[PDB]
Symmetry: D2
Subunit: 442 residues, 4 copies
């Protein structure tokens, strides 16, 4: 994809360059390849200084939780140059991965696969750009009708505010860390999204006997609890969960069909109540769950401590189920905080050097980013309403049919449990290219 | 165990000789064995003509869903002669089972294990006897024994036995949808292997057979039908969108540990009810993952041959409910808050109710304390009796129907070895000291 | 690929259209595709349509090789002839993803190869059984051989036809191997003819036939296991010389001998090291069974032990360390009498004996008999170079003419030679060696 | 079992208190329990200061490679108190092990079970006792036939020599470390049997970037190669194997029937040629093989290194196949040795240690029995045990009330299960009937 001058009127601007935007960029490339099919002025803005995929949780040994066939191209076109298999071949690694007999690459490897993808679009991506607002624009003096948008971004290095004009906008900014409201702010209280990048700076000495607590019972909580035991081999770690136990993620094959690309149509057209009941019944596919293999390795590690000492209170690493944090003392010059625990049903204290908080994410950042254009929604809406093709509803007497804003990655409530994942990314990128660029390339 | 003359006043009579009563019999044997602990008058009444474990569902290839370590003795005393490993050694099969490298024996094999246990108690078990009522007795207004009346299934004659203590261990009764009519071609899962072959005699005919439900039994029946009638057209009808996997992940699975019954029983009703609901995936409306996948590959091969799933020989109809049954004509609607199948048979795999003891005890429920509409079992499974109406040497115990008070392990094999031990100490404890 | 008129001088004629030749046609197609980067080519195939070992497409049989080792992906994952691309064209890619397996059903993997093969219909002549490769000399003044005449028998009409080509590839797989001393009888059927021939012999699926199976490898286990479902009342007997079925090896360090990049290193080794290396890796391919199938068969036997502790009474039995000493097959009797002795006093009466004893890969020697005098003086076997071209006497054969062997070269090229393992990459090298300079 | 006074004439003296002898003592207990069936003078001598099972190879995370049902009692009688399942019950862990859902306990745990068994026989076991010779004895001067043996043991603490008299002797001494001949003696060259016990004493600082080499391709080499990478996370380890690859151990179910106890009869009665051919064809069940799960993990580790750098030669931890050591230079002050390698059809490594995982020889019984070697029948140069493991003696030189039995060193005559735990439970039973059968009847 060729770059467009920054001051020119773009056909599309995407906010964020994570996998969701990357799959749009790939799909456009493939849609423009005569070899694969029957140029738009595009750019991408990403706040990070270079492409990176959840680097705070690139835990040593952590694995993907989705078949590599669900990559950024293969489900739309296995012939694409951006398949995961073509990447291995380009690296001289395909025969070697074949002998792994796994559908589950290491997270480190799949991120390098996406880095290999992203770097081929570097001419159309501006890194170190934090988008802060979308502002309406009207190109014609005669009309009060909005027919473009001005996107404003702050450069993370200079702080300078730059402005770009585009006819259409995509918001693909993933999630922001979700914290329990009652925890106080403190350098020693670190969300899972920043585990690998900040906790080593906080606890520099790998051999010191730190007390480190982990809050949560889902995949990130189990991976952090397990990694800590290897990363700090002399530590005393504690897993604090509201649930009675870690529970297994569900990717049994019939259940897993809710993630098929062709289900988005059927999910979207069902009623709101039916959608919420469906999301709840399938909660075990994605939320507050741990891969069984990790459950079993952690259970075996607990069992070995039981062999060595039958008294669980003396174990080096413990799990405290059905617990909730009632108070955290974080004042004073001392190394450690005092966490107060009660049962999580409708006394005990831990002194810890750090509390890792694995409570997931919110996906509501588009509301702050779009506030200066929310007066363009149809009358009476307090939320953005994406259509099946992901374009939000605008008042048609206020917005031209040539302008629009699309949302990506935050539509689980309307489009299904695959919306925030990689599951439908290859196909969605294709649908998006037809939606945003169809008539232009036709 | 030696027999007691039928006309004598027993120390204990157990109603039903399924695994729960068998473990009680085994625990008593071990309690009386000097090798294991350095005789009470007992007897068992069983409706079936001989020992059998869910004979309607011994489908070919069906496996146990619980480790063989959870047999009728091992968790209580690994040295017992009634362990599953001791049974295999007695059969000359222990080295061969070792090499299977499985904790989950065939259900056919596990039934044989318990049959082998049961035959060692043949002298105290009366088979072909349907208990029909438990009546109070007064040896005064204080009740100090119970008269248990049973109908012989062969003669129909009503026999009567007197006992100081009674155990009700009668498992469950088939739970049916209220809207199904009575017809020989509508069969609960409990009678699948024993009744459907007599109905569908010719294995090669193109029968249409429907299977109702989405749990382990529905999947086993659905899958077995395709092998048993290879030209049939089968349909699995589920209210749910998919079969879901059973959970025995190791931390979740500790709720079935024997020492958790103490903590579970002492929790409040609300905590017990919420605990049961969150752990529902361990036992209800769930299928062993291996079977889900096996069935999925079978669907996949049909997809290879025909991309149109509506033309497939064997189908799954998710999110459906039966609205009427009129070959029978099944009418289906969506199960969310006009389809028809014509079927030669309807298999109904909807589980069980365990409330059959209430009718069996109806004539003694006036001995409960004032204001009770249900039997209230204590931790040791003894039901509360009015202390001014029933002597303390008399009482009634419930087994297998106490999930609400004692946890999800109550109707399963999980805690039987240990529970038998508690039951023998509960019921015969002071007698043996 | 466009067809070449039959009477014209071809650049390449391949004998056989199985997977080995199929990887060649796909490779040449891709070499000519501008997205990824015409010779006069034709393929002759004895079968009337494309088919891959149809006698052993037993129900539930699975591949023993990763779908990644299909006919294109290791050479170019972008090719249109990949297995993942096949699934996508059939609208089945998402459903296969949820299978979570690298091992498709053999029935499915054959449909993928048929789907590929159908795109070359214009350059494949089916129903043509090649019978000889004859020398040709274009110049009456020269004694030099510079083209070859391939004669093929029409399987329907019996008519013989001749096609001329400068270069020949022999890609004809293997021939059924039978133990000498078994006699010929319609009730004695090699594994290669199981699905196509046994139903014609034993028509009644419910009759209590006695059926014996000879061998201890993958096909023997699959036939033994399939018979029990196909004839549910039968008595089956698996007769093995070995003491037990042994598991096939695709553990990851060992499995690298099948890497495409091992063909160079293996080939450059001496005969002794090559003969020794093949021997040490026998468990990857010969007289071995998929562990999962071993475990299933074992579970079936254990259940019979639950039902009856006397092994002699079992419906289905395995007889280890046995050899067949004699077969009585004349007489009006439906059944044969197989006489057994230990292989270090048994008779079986059987309605059929299935023989799962593998293949020989020497059939090209008869097909090349009329050109073997072009070999260098003193050779008794065709000597394939690294690029699979056989050594010819350079004073007898022009440098523009040659013959290549495919699939029969394990002795020089390693255990992957007769499998699907290196076909994608080998198809590509073959196109470079045969057509490289032409496409310059 | 009740102890017998040291100076008295014993019925049985066992050299060694490892698993083979432990199953015999357990079997004798169970034979004497009226609870299990319808006391002989016994004592056990063990060189180690207390019971231990290959503690040099109790690698963290190491698993058993045999189902727990093949413990020290269960195949002979599941009702014994010495079963693995009963041990868990005594330790209050049975339900917790059940939820593990594995037939393969940790090596750490299974050793603890045998320690739990062994401690119940502490009264008949003399630890720290190295038996050095067995000496013929004649109770009647005028008769020329031997009817007892004197077993002499050296105390590892004091050096004091102790002699004990017995009518029957069992030799159950496991193996001695087998080293390749061309390797020299050096403290930085340590056999695998001494890994956990010696290597940390050599390489004290776990964080320095040591070069450590491992020689071999079987289970022990892979276990040590994998463990070094976690134990010394900054080290560079090298696995050197003569074979081209690590190969999976075979315990598939039909092949695995060779370890069934009832097969010992059929195997023993085969001719030497058939037995030698049988051992070779089933070699992948026990020799130069690694548990598949470990192979796959080591392979995943190599693959991740390939992800980080495609050039193998720059990798931290490497595997060098089809290699042989042609020379080791180890003289001088330089901390590292120089290993010289050639293909096994000029490469050199500087190493701080060479771990040698080359298995064992089981011929130590010949030196120990040298002073009784003249009692064998004429023309034998090796001890030949009968099916019941009793060695052949000249019947004119030794009374029938006396004899010597071998345990664990009889693979050649009794099958691949002989050196393992596979038949210990049943064999212990046969041994008590052979040695004490008439005595208890
Ligand atoms: C540790 C961990 C592990 C997994 C997963 C999450 C996490 C945290 N996921 C789910 C995950 O959401 C998914 O893998 C993708 O990251 C979805 O990509 P998105 O593009 O929607 O956003 P994502 O968070 O990937 O990327 C969003 C981008 O937007 C940028 N951005 C934010 N604000 C901006 C602004 N104001 N201006 C410009 N740019 C901005 C961010 O920097 C980021 O680069 C997953 N899914 C799956 O299918 N399989 C799996 O195995 C996993 N595993
Ligand atoms: C098909 C199937 C498969 C499984 C299971 C159930 C079913 C239906 N279960 C759970 C099952 O309930 C449990 O294994 C035991 O059978 C419970 O034993 P009870 O004897 O308490 O009931 P159960 O039904 O076993 O026994 C009750 C007995 O009383 C008799 N009876 C009833 N009424 C009577 C009367 N009025 N008079 C005299 N006798 C009477 C009955 O005939 C029966 O023999 C299971 N659990 C587990 O832990 N692991 C597993 O894998 C499975 N698998
Ligand atoms: C039951 C079974 C199962 C498997 C396998 C074989 C068998 C029999 N194979 C091994 C097999 O060799 C391989 O898969 C490929 O078929 C190799 O194909 P070839 O083209 O080399 O010849 P192959 O035998 O496939 O086909 C050669 C073709 O040549 C044609 N032909 C022969 N002689 C002729 C003549 N005289 N005139 C004209 N045409 C002629 C034949 O008709 C045939 O179609 C396998 N491999 C693998 O990599 N993974 C696996 O899981 C398996 N599984
Ligand atoms: C690291 C490792 C791991 C395993 C195994 C071996 C090794 C090295 N084995 C095989 C192993 O040989 C077997 O488990 C038992 O050790 C066999 O016991 P032995 O009694 O033959 O003695 P073993 O070799 O156990 O012990 C012999 C004893 O004799 C003593 N002794 C020696 N000489 C003496 C003397 N001169 N005087 C006094 N005492 C003396 C020694 O001190 C020692 O205690 C195994 N098997 C299996 O079935 N499953 C498995 O998973 C494994 N795993
Ligand atoms: N959390 C990851 C879920 C991935 C999903 N099961 C899929 O197969 O697409
Ligand atoms: N017969 C199967 C050979 C496949 C080979 N192990 C491979 O991985 O290429
Ligand atoms: N090397 C350990 C051998 C274990 C053996 N396969 C058995 O089943 O006894």
């Amino acid at each position: 994809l060729r770059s467009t001058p920054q001051d020119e009127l773009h056909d599309l601007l995407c906010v964020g360059f994570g996998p969701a935007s990357l799959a749009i960029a790939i799909a456009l490339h493939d849609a423009l390849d005569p070899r694969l099919n029957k140029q738009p002025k595009i750019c991408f803005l990403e706040r990070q200084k270079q492409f990176a995929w959840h680097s705070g949780m690139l835990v040593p040994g952590s694995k993907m939780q989705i078949s590599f066939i669900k990559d950024l191209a293969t489900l739309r076109d296995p012939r694409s140059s951006f398949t995961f298999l073509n990447y291995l071949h380009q690296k001289g690694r395909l025969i070697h991965f074949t002998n792994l007999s796994t559908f589950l690459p290491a997270r480190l490897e799949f991120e390098d696969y996406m880095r290999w993808c992203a770097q081929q679009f570097s001419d159309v991506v501006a890194y170190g750009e934090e988008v802060v607002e979308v502002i309406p624009g009207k190109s014609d003096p005669s009309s009060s009708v909005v027919d473009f948008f001005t996107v404003r971004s702050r450069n993370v290095e200079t702080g300078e505010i730059s402005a770009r004009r585009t006819r259409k906008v995509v918001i693909a900014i993933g999630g922001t860390a979700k914290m329990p409201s009652g925890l106080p702010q403190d350098p020693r209280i670190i969300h899972s999204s920043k585990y690998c990048t900040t906790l080593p700076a906080l606890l520099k000495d790998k051999s010191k006997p730190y007390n480190i607590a982990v809050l949560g019972s889902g995949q990130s909580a189990a991976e952090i609890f397990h990694d800590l035991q290897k990363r700090y081999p002399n530590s005393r770690t504690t897993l604090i969960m509201r649930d009675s136990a870690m529970r297994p993620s569900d990717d049994s094959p019939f259940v897993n069909e809710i993630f098929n690309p062709e289900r988005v149509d059927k999910f979207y057209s069902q009623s709101a109540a039916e959608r919420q009941r469906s999301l709840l019944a399938d909660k075990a596919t994605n939320y507050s769950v741990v891969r069984l293999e990790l459950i079993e390795e952690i259970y075996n590690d607990m069992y070995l401590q039981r062999v060595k000492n039958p008294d669980e209170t003396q174990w080096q690493h413990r799990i405290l189920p059905e617990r909730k944090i009632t108070r955290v003392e974080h004042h004073g010059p001392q190394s450690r905080m005092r966490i107060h625990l009660k049962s999580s049903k409708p006394k005990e204290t831990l002194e810890v050097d750090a509390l890792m908080v694995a409570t997931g994410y919110n996906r509501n950042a588009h509301e702050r980013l779009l506030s200066k254009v929310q007066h363009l929604r149809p009358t009476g809406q307090d939320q953005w309403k994406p259509h099946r093709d992901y374009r939000v509803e605008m008042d048609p007497s206020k917005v031209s049919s040539e302008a629009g804003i699309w949302l990506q990655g935050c539509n689980e409530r309307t489009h299904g449990l695959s919306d925030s994942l990689l599951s439908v990314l290859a196909v969605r990128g294709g649908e998006m290219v037809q939606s945003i660029f169809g008539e232009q390339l036709e």
